[PDB]
């Protein structure tokens, strides 16, 4: 019975000069720390136990206590930053890296998990694990001809820990470390386990969340087609990270955006823009807005894939945050589109849902919508149809909303609305 010990009892055994007594007390600690109901992490720390557990990690002659202390420390490091700091301050990082070479797979697996929790705390501990040299021995655990010969849960823990070494910003991970890890990530992105695939996508989503140079590192490895494939998965835990990565990539250059289009991404958006999960719809529309902010041949691909009606749809009815991203998508479209393309947008029914959003209580969206209108009127000037458009806006309740906005707090608001009235409604 190593179930239900007190912290006092645990200390009494760990302080005995008896390796087996110490092993029993350490397993008692592990069991305390792995219960679902409020594990006593702070009590264990305050008792002074972390250095003892860390020293046990190196008892190569007694693998069972290696395992139990590894598990106990993993769960202490699963806590707050203060609690994770206590494990790091105990010297655990070099000890856990040594354990990655254990002949016992359940012990090296536990060291992988622990290092994951430590790197997961944030930039500084992530960089400290990398400085202690964790990356080489981690990648060596995956150097096998066929990943399917590894145990499912073992491979899942490795992938998870690798994703945490790619995670966080200010600063982003070291470029040399990212180069070392990317080949393996690419391989894991082609493995058939849903969990490996979700964490592999999260990892790529972290790496692509930066300057164009970071994006380029990823795009150069050729993973965009595989990302678009996973974008079409049925498992929402895969789609979510894959969509986030595609969206990061289209914040880049027009040349990087094009590789996403060339890979087929736009064919998946009819479903993404009608997806029942609000965050999918939000992220798909933000991605669309960064695509309508590209070249005119790229706006044209949006048109050819039949996505303008779906943007009209999201503008008409969706969570407000999604509608806001849809408005951005329209302003970018009208700002960089041809005349023919802006005409098409109007013929798809954009004006009424655009007008209905002017009575929203968000200052920024109103600015966005007014810019878009302005842009459309400019295209109507070029066709000398500014009157037809004025009538249209009048017929759906639009002129009322624009005139009311003239007497509105913000400056850009009253300036832009007053301009429109003077210029097209006189």
């Amino acid at each position: 019975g190593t179930v239900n010990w007190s912290v006092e009892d645990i200390v009494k055994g760990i302080n005995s000069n008896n390796l087996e007594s110490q092993l029993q007390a350490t397993q008692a600690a592990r069991k305390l720390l792995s219960r679902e109901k409020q594990p006593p992490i702070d009590n264990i720390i305050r008792a002074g136990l972390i250095p003892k557990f860390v020293s046990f990690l190196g008892k190569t002659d007694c693998s069972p206590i290696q395992f139990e202390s590894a598990w106990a420390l993993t769960n202490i490091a699963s806590g707050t930053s203060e609690q994770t700091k206590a494990v790091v301050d105990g010297g655990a990082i070099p000890a856990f890296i040594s354990l990655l070479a254990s002949p016992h797979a359940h012990i090296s697996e536990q060291a992988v998990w622990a290092l994951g929790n430590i790197a997961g705390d944030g930039s500084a501990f992530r960089d400290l694990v990398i400085k202690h040299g964790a990356i080489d021995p981690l990648l060596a655990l995956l150097a096998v001809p066929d990943l399917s010969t590894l145990a499912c849960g073992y491979l899942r823990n490795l992938t998870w820990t690798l994703s945490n070494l790619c995670r966080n910003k200010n600063p982003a991970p070291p470029l040399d470390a990212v180069e070392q890890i990317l080949p393996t990530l690419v391989r894991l992105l082609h493995h058939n386990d849903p969990e490996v695939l979700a964490d592999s996508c999260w990892a790529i989503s972290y790496l692509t969340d930066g300057p164009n140079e970071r994006i380029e590192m990823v795009v150069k490895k050729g993973v965009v087609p595989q990302l678009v494939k996973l974008l079409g998965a049925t498992e929402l835990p895969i789609v979510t990270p894959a969509l986030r990565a595609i969206g990061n990539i289209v914040t880049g250059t027009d040349e990087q955006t094009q590789k996403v289009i060339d890979a087929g991404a736009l064919a998946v958006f009819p479903s993404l823009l009608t997806n029942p999960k609000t965050n999918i719809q939000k992220e798909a529309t933000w991605t669309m807005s960064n695509i309508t902010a590209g070249r005119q041949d790229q706006i044209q691909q949006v048109v050819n894939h039949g996505l303008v009606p779906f943007l009209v749809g999201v503008l008409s009815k969706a969570d407000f945050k999604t509608q806001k991203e849809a408005a951005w998508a329209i302003t970018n479209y009208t700002s960089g589109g041809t005349v023919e393309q802006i005409v098409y947008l109007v013929h798809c029914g954009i004006i009424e849902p655009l007008m209905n959003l002017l009575s929203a209580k968000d200052t920024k969206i109103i600015q966005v919508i007014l810019d878009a209108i302005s842009n459309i009127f400019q295209a109507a000037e070029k066709l000398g149809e500014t009157e037809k458009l004025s009538i249209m806006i009048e017929e759906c309740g639009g002129l009322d909303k624009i005139e009311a906005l003239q007497r509105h707090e913000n400056e850009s608001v009253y300036k832009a609305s007053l301009n429109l009235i003077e210029k097209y409604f006189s």
Partner: peptide, 6 residues
């Protein structure tokens, strides 16, 4: 750039 980031 009209492109917006996260």
């Amino acid at each position: 750039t009209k492109k917006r980031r996260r």
